[PDB]
Design a protein around this ligand. Structure first.
Ligand SMILES: [Ca+2]
Ligand SMILES: [Ca+2]
Ligand SMILES: [Ca+2]
Ligand SMILES: [Ca+2]
Ligand SMILES: [Ca+2]
Ligand SMILES: [Cl-]
Ligand SMILES: [Cl-]
Ligand SMILES: [Cl-]
Ligand SMILES: [Cl-]
Ligand SMILES: [Cl-]
Ligand SMILES: [Cu+2]
Ligand SMILES: [Cu+2]
Ligand SMILES: [Cu+2]
Ligand SMILES: [Cu+2]
Ligand SMILES: [Cu+2]
Ligand SMILES: [Cu+2]
Ligand SMILES: [Cu+2]
Ligand SMILES: [Cu+2]
Ligand SMILES: [Cu+2]
Ligand SMILES: [Cu+2]
Ligand SMILES: [Cu+2]
Ligand SMILES: [Cu+2]
Lengths: 151, 151, 152, 150, 149, 151, 151, 151, 151, 151, 151, 151
C-alpha cells in the first residue's frame, strides 16, 4: 500500500500548510465581512485539523511514518506560503482559501484514486468524505464571491 | 366558521409556495452576504413550515380538509414562482423575501379579521403570532436593505 | 460534466419534494388505531426526506447545476403522482402508500448510485448510498408493521 | 366576579379532570396501552399546568381558589365512576375525549366572560388552554377513526 | 395487608397533595418566596410516591382508589378551607403534621409488607419514609426546632 | 398618548427607569431576606429588559423612533428616582418594587386599550403578555409582605 | 456464602439467555404494534444487560468466577431458546417476553431469599431492585395483552 | 477621581451610558451588515452590563455608594449621547462603538493605575480583565473598518 | 445476494461471540492498567453490539433470517471461547482482544468483497465503516502493547 | 436508636479521616499510573463526602449531634494518619486506599447490623448502599494490584 | 519562594478548618432562614475546597509538602473550633461565617503580599482571585445581617 | 527580544513548534500508558493552541504582525524538532513533553517580565495564566515519571 501511504502523508504535509494559511487569513483579515469570515476560518481550521489527524493516524495504522515536523510539512507540501499582509482585501483572502481548497479537493481525489487502485477502501472513504465537505465549502466561498463553484 | 377554514387553507397553499421561494433564494444566492443570508433562509423556512403545519392542523381540527398536493398549493396560492437564476443580486433576493413576507403579513391580517369576526379565537391567535414575527423580519430585512420597514 | 449524475440529483429534488408532500398528506389525513404513533413518525420521515432534498440540491449546485426550485418544476418532473387528501383511507393503506413511496425512492437512489458510480462522481455516489440505506431500513420496519417481509 | 367564578370553576373541573385521567392511566388494558398509558401522563401534566396558572390568576385577582377535595367534587360538573379494568382502550380514550370536550366548552365560557369584563389576561389563559385541548381532541378522535366534531 | 396500606397511601397522598397545594396558594408572610416554590417540590415528590404506590398495587392485582370521593373518604388527613390569614409558621407547622402522618403511614407500610414477605413494596415505603423524615428535619429546623421524629 | 407608537415609546422610557430602580434595590438592599431578594432583582431586571427591547423594536417595526438616551428616558418617564440609600428596609424595598410594577401594569393596560382601539393586535398582545407577568409578580411580592395583591 | 454466589451465577446465565430471546423478538417481530414494541425490546435488553453486569461483578467482588462463554450461558440457563420465526404474532411475542420476565422475577425472588438467609444484604438489594422493575414490566406487558398481571 | 472607589463609580456612570449608546446603535442600525452587527451589539451590551455590575458591587464591597439613578449616570459620565438617527452608515455606527470602547479602555487603564497605586489588587484585576476584552473588540471592529487597532 | 446474506449472518454469530469474549476480558482482568482497560472493554462491547444489530437488521432487511440463539452463535462462529481465568496477564488479555479484532477486520474485508461483487453497496458500506474503526483500535491496542499495528 | 446513632457518628469521624487520607494519596502520589489514580482519588473523595454528609444528616434527623470539629474526628476515628511521603510507590498508595476501604466496609457492615437490630430501616439502607459501592471499589483496586478482592 | 510556600501551607490548614466550621454551621443551623442558608453553606464549602486543592497543588508544584493530616490542619490553623450547638441563632451562625471569611481574606492578603515580594506571580494571582470572592461573600453576608461589609 | 510584542511573536513561533512536537508524541507513542497519554496529548495541544491564538491576537491588537508561516515558526522558535521515531519509550516521550513545557514556562516568565517592565498588564496576565497551567502540567508529568516537579 506504498502509494496509499505516500498520498496520506502528502495530505498530512498539505493539510498542515493549509492550516497555517487559514490561520494567517484569520489573523490578517481586514475589511467589511471580517466579523463573519474571521471566525469562519476557525471552523475551517478545525475541520482541516480533523482531516489531518485522521489521515495521519490512518497512515500510522497502515504501518507508515507520518511527517511530524514543520520542516517535513513545508518541504513536502505543494502549497506555498507568503508573509502575512493586512492589505490583502476580503475578496482576495476568500479567493486564496478557495485556491487552497481547490488544491485539497484535487489532492483528495488523488488519494481517492490511488487508494481505490490499491484496494484500500478504508482510506478511500476518508478521502471521499473530506472531498465532499471541501467541495461544498468551495461552492459557498465562490457564492459569497458572486461566482459559480467551477469545480 | 367557513371563512376561517378558507383563510387557513389559503395560508397552507401560500406558505407552501413561500417555502419553495425561500428554498430557491437559499440555493441560487450569490454575492457578498451569502454566508449570513444563506443560513438565514433556513431559519425563515423552518418558521414558515411551523406556521404551515399549525394552520393546517387547526383547519383539520375545525373539520376542514387541508390542501395537501403540490397542484393544490400552486393553484390556490396567490404567490407566483419563477425559475431560479444565479444572477439575481443579493439585494434583489432579499427584496423578494420582503415582498413574500409582506404578502404573508397581509394574509395573516385577513386571517385575524376573519377568525375574529367568526369568534374563532384560537385561529385568531395563530395568525397574530405569525404576523408578529413576520413583521419583525420585515423590519430586519428592510434595515439590511438600508430602508425603513414601511409596513 | 457528470451529465447524468446531475440529472439524477435533480430528479431526486423533484421526487423528494413530491414525496414530502405525500408524507405530509398522510400525516394530516391519518385516522385509525396507530395514529398516535404513525402521525409523528411521518414528521421524522419528512425531516429525513427534507435532509436528502437539501443535500442533493446543494450537491447539484456544487457541481454547476441548477436545481428545480418551483412547485411546477417539482410536479412536472417527479414520477410520483398525488391524489386529494382522504380521511377514509385506513392506517394500513396509509402505511402501504408510504412503503410504495419509499420503494420508489430506494429505486431512484439506486439509479443515482449506479449513475454516479459510472461517471466517477464518488461524493454523489455516497450521498445516494446513505439515503438508500436508510430508506430500505424504513421499508423493513413499515412492512413489519404491516405483517410483511421487506420484499426489497 | 364572573371571571373569578369561571377561574374557580376550572380549578374544580381541572382537579377532577386530573383524577379521571389518572384513573384512565391506571386501569387501562388492551392493545395500545404502551402508547396511551404514558400519554395520560402528558395530559395530566398539561392539566395540572392550567390548574395552577388559573388558580394563581384567581389569587392575583383577589379571589380564594377551591383548595380541598370536597370543593373540587361538589363544584365540578365532571362525574367520576369507580375504576374498572373491563373498559376497552377505545372507551377509555372516548372518556378522555368527553372530558376534553367539557374543558374546551368551559374554557370558551371563560374566554367569553373575561372578554366581556375586559380581563384580557384571564382571556388569554383560557384561549391558550382551549387551543391545546382542541388539538388533543382532534388527535384522540383520529385514533378513534373519527373527525374531531368540535 | 400490603395492598390495603398501598391504597391507604394513595388516598392520603392525594389529600396531602391538595393540602400542600393549599399552602402553596394561600401562603403570605416573610419566607413566601422560598416556601411557595418549595411546596411545588414537595407536591412533585408526593405525586411520585402516589403513582409509584398505586402502580405497585395494580401490579399486585389490586384496584387503586381513583376518584376524589374515594381519596377523601379513605384518607385519614383532614382538609379545611383555604385561609390567607394563616401565618407562614402555621403553614409550615401544618406541612410537618402532614409529613409526620405520612412517615408513620410509610412505617406501617414497611412493617406490613415486611411481615408479608413483599420486599419490593417494603422498599418503596422505606425510600419514601427516608425522604419525608429528612424533610421533617429541615422544616423543623426552619421552625427553630429539633426533628422530634 | 394618542396612539400605539406613543405608548410603546412611553414604555421604553418607563422600563429604562424601572430597570435603574430595580438595580438600585439590588445594590443597596440590606436586611433579612437579602440572599433571596438580591438575585430576584436580577430576574426582574432581565424580564424588564425583555419588555424594553420587544416594545422598542415593535415601535421601530411600526416606523417610529424609540427614545435612546438617558435624558430622554429620564424626562419622558413618569417614574421618579431617588438617591441610593442603604438604610431602606427590605420590606420598604419590596414595597417600592410593587409601586413600580403597579405603575407598569397600568401603563400596559393603557397600551392594551390604545392598541385594541387602533386594531394593532401584535402590539396589543405584547402589552397583554407583559401585564400578565407583572401582575403575577405583584401577587408574590405582596404575599411576601403579608398583603393581598390589591390590583 | 456459596448459595448467593450460585444464584448470582445462575442469573448471569439466565440474563444472557434472556437478552438473546429479547433480541430475537426485536428482530423477528411482525404485525401491528411493531413500531412501539421493536424499540421497547431495546429498553428491556439494556435493562437486562445492566442486571447481568451488576450481578456478574457482585459475584467477582465476592470471590467468584462468573460464567463468561456462550456455552456456559446456554447450558446453565433454565430458559430455552428456539429458532427465530417471523410468523409469530405480536401477542405471542409479548407473551413470550412475559414468560421470560416471570422466570426472571422468580429467579430474583430466589436470589433475594438465598442472599437474605446468608446475610449478604448487598446481593439482596441487587435482586430486590431488579425484581421490582421486572414485575412493573409484567403488569404493563399484561395490560397491553388485555390481562391482569397475575403475579 | 483620585481613588479606586471614585474610578469604580466613574465606571458605573460611563458603563451605564455606554450601554445606552450601544442600544441606540442596535435599534437605529441600517445598511449591509445589519444582520451581523445588530445582534453583535447585544453581546457588547451584555459584556458592558457584566462590567457595570461587578464594578458597582466591588464599590459596595469597599464601602462606597454606587451611582444608581439615570441622573447620576448622565451627569457623571464623560460620554455624550445624541438623538437616535436611522441614516447613519454602518461604518459610522462601528466608528462610534470604537470611540466608546477607546474611552472605556482608557478609563480602565486609569482604574488599573489608581488601584495598583492603592494596593487594591482585587479592583486592579477587574479593570485589567475588562480592558483586555475591550481592546480585543477594538481590534476586531477596526479590522471590519479595514484599519489597524491603533490603541 | 446469497453471499452478502451469508457473510452478514456469519458476522452476527462472530460479533455475538466477540462480545462474550470482551465481556470475559472486562470481568477477569487483573494487573496494572485495569482501571483503564476494564471500562475500555465496555466501549468496545458497545461498538461490537452496534455492528451486531446493524448487520443483523441489514440481513433482515435483505430478506434473511439472522442467527438469534446462543447455540446458533456458538456453532456458527469461527471464534473460540475458553473458561474465564483471573491469572491471564493484562498483556495477554489485550493480545487476545487484538486477535479477536484481527479476525473481525478480516471477516469485514470478506464482507466488503462479497457485497462489492454482488453490487450490495449498502452492506458494502456497513462492512467498510466497521473495518475502519476496528483497524484503528488494533493500532491503539498494539501501540499499548509496544508494537506496530501489523495489519 | 442509641447505637444506630453511635455508629452513624463513628462513620462521620471515620469518613472525615478517610477523606483526609485520600487527599494525601491524591497529593503525594508519584509513579506510573499517576494520571489515572490522581483524579480517581477525587471521585473516591466526592463519594466519601456524600456518605459523610448523608450519615451526619441522618444522625441529626434522629435527634443526634454529629461530631463537627477535627478534634472530634481525630479522637473518634479508628483510622490512623501519617505524614505525607512522596517516596511511597503507586502500588503502596493504592494498597493504603484498599485498607481504608476494607475498614469502611467493615464499619458499614457494623452500621447495617446495628440498625437492623433496632429496626431503623432508613439508616439500614444507607449503610447497605455505601457498603455495596466500597466493596466494588475494593474489587477494582485489588484487580489493578493483580489481586483477588479478598473481602 | 520560602514565604510563598509557607503561606500556601497555612491556607491548606486554615481552609481545612474553615470547611469543618462551615459544615458545622450547615448541620447545626436552626431558625428562620435555614432553607436558604443551609444549602448556601454547601456552595461556600465547595468554593473553600477549591481553594484548598489549588493552593495545596501550587505548593506541591513549587516543591513543597502540604499538610495532609487532621493533626497538621488543626495544629497549624489559626482558626478555633467549638462543639456543635443547635441553640446558636441563625444570625450568630452567619456572624461566625463572616469572621472566618474575614480571617481568610486577611490570610489571602498576606499570601498576596508575600508572593508579590517573592516574585511568585502565579501564587499571587491565586490569592487575589480567592480574596475577591471571599470579600464579595462578606458584603453579601453583612447585607443579610443589616450591616456594611466593613472590610 | 526586547518588548512585549517581540516576546508575543516568539511565543507564536515556539507554541507552533511545541504543537508540532506534541502531535509527534501523540502519533509515535508506543508502550504501556499509550491509552492514557495519547489522548492527553490532544488536551495539551488544544491548550497550547489556545495560547498561540490569544498571544497572536494580542500582538495583532498591539499593532504587530504575527509570524504566520511554517518557515517563520521553525526559524524563529528555539525548540528543535527531530524525525518521528516509534522506538522512543513512553517515559522518554513524557520527558520530552516536560522539556518542552519547561521551555514554555521559561518563555512565559520572560513574557511576564518584559510586559511588566513596559506596564502592559493585559499581556502580562496572558503570560501569567499560561505559565500557571504549564507549571501544573509539569508537576503532573513529573509525578507520572516518579519525580518532583523541579521547576
Ligand atoms: Ca451576481
Ligand atoms: Ca403475521
Ligand atoms: Ca509488548
Ligand atoms: Ca518513587
Ligand atoms: Ca433557636
Ligand atoms: Cl460551476
Ligand atoms: Cl450581489
Ligand atoms: Cl369535524
Ligand atoms: Cl400480529
Ligand atoms: Cl499484568
Ligand atoms: Cu490523534
Ligand atoms: Cu403536523
Ligand atoms: Cu441548504
Ligand atoms: Cu403554583
Ligand atoms: Cu403512572
Ligand atoms: Cu434588540
Ligand atoms: Cu462491567
Ligand atoms: Cu448584581
Ligand atoms: Cu435493533
Ligand atoms: Cu448537608
Ligand atoms: Cu487535587
Ligand atoms: Cu483567533
Amino acid at each position: 500500500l506504498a502509494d496509499s501511504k505516500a498520498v496520506l502523508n502528502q495530505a498530512v504535509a498539505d493539510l498542515s500548510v493549509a492550516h497555517s494559511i487559514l490561520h494567517q487569513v484569520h489573523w490578517y483579515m481586514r475589511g467589511r465581512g471580517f466579523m463573519i469570515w474571521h471566525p469562519k476560518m476557525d471552523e475551517y481550521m478545525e475541520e482541516i485539523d480533523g482531516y489531518l489527524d485522521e489521515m495521519s493516524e490512518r497512515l500510522i495504522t497502515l504501518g507508515g511514518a507520518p511527517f511530524s515536523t514543520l520542516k517535513e510539512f513545508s518541504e513536502n507540501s505543494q502549497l506555498k506560503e507568503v508573509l502575512g499582509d493586512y492589505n490583502v482585501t476580503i475578496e482576495e483572502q476568500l479567493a486564496r482559501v478557495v485556491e487552497v481548497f481547490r488544491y485539497l479537493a484535487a489532492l483528495f481525489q488523488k488519494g481517492f484514486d490511488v487508494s481505490d487502485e490499491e484496494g484500500d477502501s478504508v482510506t478511500n472513504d476518508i478521502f471521499n468524505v473530506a472531498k465532499a465537505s471541501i467541495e461544498k465549502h468551495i461552492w459557498m466561498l465562490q457564492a459569497e464571491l458572486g461566482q459559480a463553484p467551477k469545480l
